[PDB]
Design an enzyme around this catalytic site. Structure first.
Site, PDB file in Angstrom:
ATOM      1  N   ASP A   7       0.892  -1.141   0.000  1.00  0.00           N
ATOM      2  CA  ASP A   7       0.000   0.000   0.000  1.00  0.00           C
ATOM      3  C   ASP A   7       0.947   1.211   0.000  1.00  0.00           C
ATOM      4  OD1 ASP A   7      -1.733   2.144   0.607  1.00  0.00           O
ATOM      5  OD2 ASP A   7      -1.981   1.526   2.702  1.00  0.00           O
ATOM      6  N   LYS A  68       2.584  11.381  -3.828  1.00  0.00           N
ATOM      7  CA  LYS A  68       1.400  10.749  -4.415  1.00  0.00           C
ATOM      8  C   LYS A  68       0.424  11.781  -4.979  1.00  0.00           C
ATOM      9  CE  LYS A  68      -1.894   7.021  -3.428  1.00  0.00           C
ATOM     10  NZ  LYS A  68      -2.238   5.980  -2.423  1.00  0.00           N
ATOM     11  N   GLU A 172      -7.412   0.504  -4.141  1.00  0.00           N
ATOM     12  CA  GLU A 172      -7.356   0.433  -2.692  1.00  0.00           C
ATOM     13  C   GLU A 172      -8.638  -0.104  -2.052  1.00  0.00           C
ATOM     14  OE1 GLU A 172      -5.793   4.279  -1.425  1.00  0.00           O
ATOM     15  OE2 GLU A 172      -4.063   3.944  -2.716  1.00  0.00           O
ATOM     16  N   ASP A 196     -12.861   5.158   3.851  1.00  0.00           N
ATOM     17  CA  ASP A 196     -11.424   5.288   4.008  1.00  0.00           C
ATOM     18  C   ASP A 196     -10.938   6.690   4.356  1.00  0.00           C
ATOM     19  OD1 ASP A 196      -8.672   5.073   3.800  1.00  0.00           O
ATOM     20  OD2 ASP A 196      -8.686   4.365   1.728  1.00  0.00           O
TER      21      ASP A 196
HETATM   22  K   LIG Z   1      -1.533   3.842   3.729  1.00  0.00           K
HETATM   23  K   LIG Z   2      -7.706   7.611   1.939  1.00  0.00           K
HETATM   24 MG   LIG Z   3      -4.724   5.090   2.653  1.00  0.00          MG
END
Ligand SMILES: [K+]
Ligand SMILES: [K+]
Ligand SMILES: [Mg+2]
Ligand SMILES: Nc1ncnc2c1ncn2[C@@H]1O[C@H](COP(=O)(O)OP(=O)(O)O)[C@@H](O)[C@H]1O
Ligand SMILES: [Cl-]
Ligand SMILES: [Cl-]
EC number: 3.6.4.10
Length: 378
Positions: A7, A68, A172, A196
């Site tokens: 991840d 990112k 994800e 999330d």
């Molecule tokens: K993460």
């Molecule tokens: K997130």
């Molecule tokens: Mg995350």
């Protein structure tokens, strides 16, 4: 390999490996199950992960993070232009492509977002190798469901540069679902909602799963809402407190503020398990120590609006997915911020008491699913 699942997060990265029917989330050299997606450059060395974040307060201009947010994007992008205004490091234009510019060994150097990320991935790869005692080559790397072809390509490139053979790039939320075995065939289709809340982004995804095939029904959220925003509310609260107690404003002392932020972040984590936390900082400002405490109730009030606001994207996602609350078969918690009790309460209340899938550490769920998939693909 065995192959590993990684991840590559906006703020933290995590690596897992599926062995003997079980996923092992791998702890780093410092014993941490997640590693800051940070890289720092100094007159003599390049630091990565914990070592890099541990010195961010003293080296703000050469400590890179949020790579990112740039990966796969163009310099002229509005979001890139907006983000630049908030970062302490420089971002330059190389033929329309963004690059982070830093000082390293006394010389000016620039790195593409994928290069910075390859460094973080190299760290995750090494973390896995130290645990396995074997060379790791194959890996499954995750990305947000909203990432486009360019962002996905750049993320895969980060892996390749790090010496990884990226078996596949998966979403994800899908990885989180796989972690809980929600990909198993049970006959009819199921609707799963992934909530999330990480360190910097909030993603709500509704997935429809049938025969092991995932369909992203809708996505919602805020790319600029996460745990760091909660730390900020605490930082302001304590700056005011210090000011009352010492008639001194620490706001303009960048290092002091950053150290207070670090103390707040840790106090916050403690408030997820206890109703009170102590903050004890030495030489915060002008040699004045700052010893104090904060209650869970206090923490909740300071962030009341932000917490409550996480429900708007949930409603929006449901609307776009054309589903009512009752049509959601499972709710999966992802992101370290979902460990906050008040958030779980808000979400559960919104879903009228429905239980939340939260047995797997939310900040490890994505890597967990990635590891499972990596094993499957190997
Ligand atoms: K993460
Ligand atoms: K997130
Ligand atoms: Mg995350
Ligand atoms: N126990 C906890 N309680 C509250 N917040 C936590 C806890 N553990 C981690 N966090 C927060 O989770 C955020 C990081 O989320 P994570 O999912 O690990 O990474 P990413 O943001 O890269 O997706 C940080 O803001 C961190 O402070
Ligand atoms: Cl490490
Ligand atoms: Cl409430």
């Amino acid at each position: 390999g065995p192959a590993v699942g990684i991840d590559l997060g906006t703020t933290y990265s995590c690596v897992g490996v599926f062995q003997h029917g079980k996923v092992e989330i791998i702890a780093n050299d410092q014993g941490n199950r997640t590693t800051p997606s940070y890289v720092a450059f100094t007159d003599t060395e390049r630091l990565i992960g914990d070592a890099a974040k541990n010195q961010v307060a003293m080296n703000p201009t050469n400590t890179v993070f949020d790579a990112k947010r740039l990966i796969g994007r163009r310099f002229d992008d509005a979001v890139v232009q907006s983000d630049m205004k908030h970062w302490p490091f420089m971002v330059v234009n190389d033929a329309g492509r963004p690059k982070v510019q830093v000082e390293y060994k006394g010389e000016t150097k620039s790195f593409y977002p994928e290069e910075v990320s390859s460094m973080v991935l190299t760290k995750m790869k090494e973390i896995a190798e130290a645990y396995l005692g074997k060379t790791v080559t194959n890996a499954v790397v995750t990305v947000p469901a909203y990432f486009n072809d360019s962002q996905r390509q750049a993320t895969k490139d980060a892996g390749t540069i790090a010496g990884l053979n990226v078996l596949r790039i998966i979403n994800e939320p899908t990885a989180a679902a796989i972690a809980y075995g929600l990909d198993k065939k049970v006959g009819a289709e199921r609707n799963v909602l992934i909530f999330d809340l990480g360190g910097g982004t909030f993603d709500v995804s509704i997935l429809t799963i049938e025969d092991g095939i995932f369909e992203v029904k809708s996505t919602a959220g805020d790319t600029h809402l996460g745990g760091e925003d909660f730390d900020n509310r605490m930082v302001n609260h304590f700056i005011a407190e210090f000011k009352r107690k010492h008639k001194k404003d620490i706001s303009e002392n960048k290092r002091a503020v950053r150290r207070l932020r670090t103390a707040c972040e840790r106090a916050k984590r403690t408030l997820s398990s206890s109703t009170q936390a102590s903050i004890e900082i030495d030489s915060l400002y002008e040699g004045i120590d700052f010893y104090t405490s904060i209650t869970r109730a206090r923490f909740e009030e300071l962030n009341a609006d932000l917490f409550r606001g996480t429900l708007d994207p949930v409603e929006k996602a449901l609307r776009d997915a054309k589903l009512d609350k009752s049509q959601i078969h499972d709710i999966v918690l992802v992101g370290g911020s979902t460990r906050i009790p008040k958030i779980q309460k808000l979400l559960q209340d919104f879903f009228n008491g429905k239980e939340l899938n939260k047995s797997i550490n939310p900040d490890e769920a994505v890597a967990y699913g990635a590891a499972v998939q990596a094993a499957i693909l190997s």
